[PDB]
Structures are given as C-alpha cells and as structure tokens.
Structure 1
Amino acid sequence: SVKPQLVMFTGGRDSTLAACYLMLQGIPVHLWSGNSGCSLHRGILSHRVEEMKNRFGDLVVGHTVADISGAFRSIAIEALEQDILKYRKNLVLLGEKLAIHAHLVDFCRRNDINTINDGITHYQMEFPEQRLVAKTFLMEMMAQYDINYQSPVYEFAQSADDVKYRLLQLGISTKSLEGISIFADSFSTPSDDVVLAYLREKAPLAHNIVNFLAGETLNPP
C-alpha cells in the first residue's frame, strides 16, 4: 500500500489517464470533482468512474463531488460586470479553477492528503489555467498550505489521439465523459498578463474562503 493522493477528475480523457497512470504504479487515488452549479449533463461522469473501479479496484479509494457553487459565485460571478469591463475578457472559468483550489486546501487538510494531481498532458490552447503563468501561481498557492501539486501525465502523450489509445490499452473508453460548463465557448483568448492579474486580484478572496472553511474567520478579506 502507498499513501493515497488526490486527482482533480472531470471525467475527461486527460484526467482519467492521470488517475489511471498513478494507479498503475500502485498509487491509490481519491478522485475529486468540483460541481460549480453551472455544469450540465454531469450524469455520464458516473459511467467513467465505473470503468475505472472495474479496471483498478481498491486503488480507487473514492470519488468526492464537491459543491463549490458558493466559492465560485464569490470569486467569479458576483463582480462579473467589473471583471469583464476591467480585463475585457470573460475569465469565469479561471475563477472556477481558483474556487476549486480553495476547496482543495480545505479538503486536503481535512482528509490528510498532501499530493494533488491534474490531467495536463499535451498542449491545449483552450485552457489558460494549463499555462505556466497560472500553474506557477496555483502551485505556489498550494505550497503555502504544504500541498504538493504534480502533473504525472505531462507530455506523456503527444496528442489527444495518444491519450485516447493509452486509455484503450487499459480497457477503458476513449471518450471524455464529463459535464459541460454553461460557460463553454463563452469567452475569447486572454493574454498571460490578464490571467496573472486576475488570479492575483481574486487570490485574497480565495484565501479568505480557505480560512472560512477551516473555521478561523467570518470576516471578508
């Protein structure tokens, strides 16, 4: 046995492979999925979890679906007017990732987990949060709470096709069985400077939410 680690798991190919690759090494994974409250057609996720339990047994130690709608709202939606007028870009989905990270601090500290993993693989332009500017920021944030952030399947596959057929060799389906954010395809591409500035602007809020969830303060930042 090894100490379980957490995987940020959406049901997509890439995070599926991340979890699978960990488990192939004997590393038990706690699958963690954030529900932001604006995600549609999330039913299929259960089919993917089933496939993974079938192939790896006990190594899937559990699947947590967390309601992060409150943190998401506070970080990304309450000041949507301000946010879009300032950055000229809809960064709601970036805010959601910050909300995920706040929740993960709480989850990790309450469940004795010190390693989290994500599904970064080959390069994907659509996801600003997979950029070094954002991942550096997020890694820093998690390290302030002594949480180790890994990307175990980084550049392990060259392309989406490489991810699909590695999963097929594992006896798992190639599809991305994830819910769809209502904000999918609802934004244009931001610069790295807008990404970093947004993360820095909302960070105080995220940290405050972390403190609230730990029972240390009610007061705003």
Structure 2
Amino acid sequence: KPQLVMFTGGRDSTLAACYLMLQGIPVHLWSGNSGCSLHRGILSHRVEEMKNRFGDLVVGHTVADISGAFRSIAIEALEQDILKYRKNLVLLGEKLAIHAHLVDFCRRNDINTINDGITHYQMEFPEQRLVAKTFLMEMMAQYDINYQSPVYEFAQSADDVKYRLLQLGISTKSLEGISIFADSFSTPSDDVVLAYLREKAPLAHNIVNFLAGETL
C-alpha cells in the first residue's frame, strides 16, 4: 500500500504527497541531501503541517545523504560535461543520483511506487521535461519500480498548485532549501538533456550495483 514521495518541502512535491494521502494511500516522504543545499531547515515546518493534516498516512520521513552519488555523476567531471554540452546540467545529474539511490532504497524497504512533484509549468528545467521523465520511467521500470508524477498534468501554472494547497489548510510557500546551483545555467535542448542522461546512465547503474553490494 505505502508509496514513496520525493519530497523537498516545495509546493509541488507537497501537493503530490497530499493528493496521494487524500486517496488513502500512505506516503513515505524521501528527501535527498546532495550536499549543496542552503537553508534547508524550513523543511521540518512543512513536514509538521502534513502530519497535522493527514496523521498516520505520513508513514516516514527519510533524509538521505546522496552527496557521493551526486558528486560522481554531476560534479566529478564538470569541466568535461560543460565543455561538451555547453550547458550546466548539474541539477539533471542530481535527479539521476536521486533515482539511483531510490532503486536501492525501494528494494531494501519493499516499495514499488515512487512519486515526485514534477509540473508541466516548469518544463524549462531539464529534470522536469517529458524527455527526462520518460527516460527515468524506463530506468525505474528496469528494476520493477513504478515512477509517477501525480501533479504533472494538472499543474499548468504555479497558481494551480498554490490554491489546492490552500484548500488543505497548508501554506502556499515553497519551504525548501535552495541549491547553490540555482540560476547558474541557461536552457538546454531536449537532445542535450537526453544525451547527458544516457552518458551518465552507466555510472548510475554502477552505483545501484554498488549500493546493492553486487559490484566494485
């Protein structure tokens, strides 16, 4: 019954968690700390709001250190990555790293649905494009994991997410940390997003294998 939600504290992943819980689906909130987030403290205010409105349906909050996988995939070869694609795709790497950790986490805790707060209105960002959602859906499916985005189609604008949150008696603010990498990049082409993901998939599967104790 319980499913995982990739939960940052921001409005989009909050609404995704909340909508699932409204349906009677318990959620394990999963927060990945990639090592470069500033002022993350406000997250726990958001978590309290949700335990207050949904009770037992919030089954868990995990904060996971994913700095090592993030660094391996996105930072270690930054000079090469940027010279090649002429774009700073660290935050796309970060999502790959998340997904790698979630494979291990799901296997080790008997979870086979994962959910995030990707939104149609934020397609400007690499990690939130159909080409990357499709790539990662396929990736997770290879390990029998269902990857859903329960607010993707509904969220045509930020105002859409804001007002439903408000109807749940939850705050409209994004109560998350910010990446230091925020606003450190221009928009990449779809083709480049997908070539990057495919360039880093080997590293990511490798890390999955490592975390499972299978290899290297």
Where on the TM-score scale, by shorter chain, does this alignment land: which range?
over 0.9
Q: Name the CA distance, whole Å, in 2 between partners of 1:64 and 1:168.
A: 25
Cα distance in structure 1, aligned partners of 2:197 and 2:120: 23
SS at 1:198 equivalent: helix
Counterparts of 1:212 and 1:53, CA distance in 2: 34
CA contact (8 A) 1:35 1:69 kept: yes
* TM-score for both structures, normalised by structure 1: 0.96
* In structure 1, C-alpha distance between the alignment counterparts of 2:99 and 2:93, rounded to whole Å: 10
1:126 Cα shift? 3.5
RMSD: 0.9
> How many Å apart are 1:150 and its aligned residue?
1.0
Of 63, 73, 76, which residue of structure 2 is paired with 1:75?
Answer: 73
Matched residue, 2:15? 17
TM-score normalised by the chain length of structure 2: 0.98
Aligned counterparts of 1:115 and 1:67: Cα–Cα separation in 2:
21
**Runs of at least 5 residues in structure 1 that lack an aligned partner in the other structure:** none
Counterparts of 2:156 and 2:125 in 1: how far apart (Å)?
17
Residue number in structure 2 paired with 1:87 = 85
Unmatched 5+ residue regions in structure 2?
none
Task: Quote the residue 1:61 is aligned against.
Answer: 59
Deviation digits for residues 133-158 of structure 1 (CA, Å, limit 9, x no counterpart): 11111000000000001111222243
Shift of 1:129: 1.3
Aligned-residue sequence identity (percent) comes to 100
1:159 Cα deviation (Å)? 1.6
Query: In the alignment, what sits opposite 1:171?
Result: 169
What is the deviation of 1:130? 1.4
127-136 vs 100-109, which moves further: 127-136
* CA displacement at 1:120 relative to structure 2: 2.2
Structure 1: 4+ residue segments shifted above 3 A = none
Q: Which moved more, 1:206-215 or 1:114-123?
A: 114-123
Change (3 A) 1:22 1:185: same
Report the number of matched residues: 216
Q: Shift of residue 123 of structure 1?
A: 1.9
CA distance in 1, matches of 2:97, 2:155: 28
1:69-98 CA-to-partner distances (Å, cap 9, x unmatched) read 000000011100000000000001110000
- Matched ranges for 1:37-186 at <5 A: 37-186=35-184
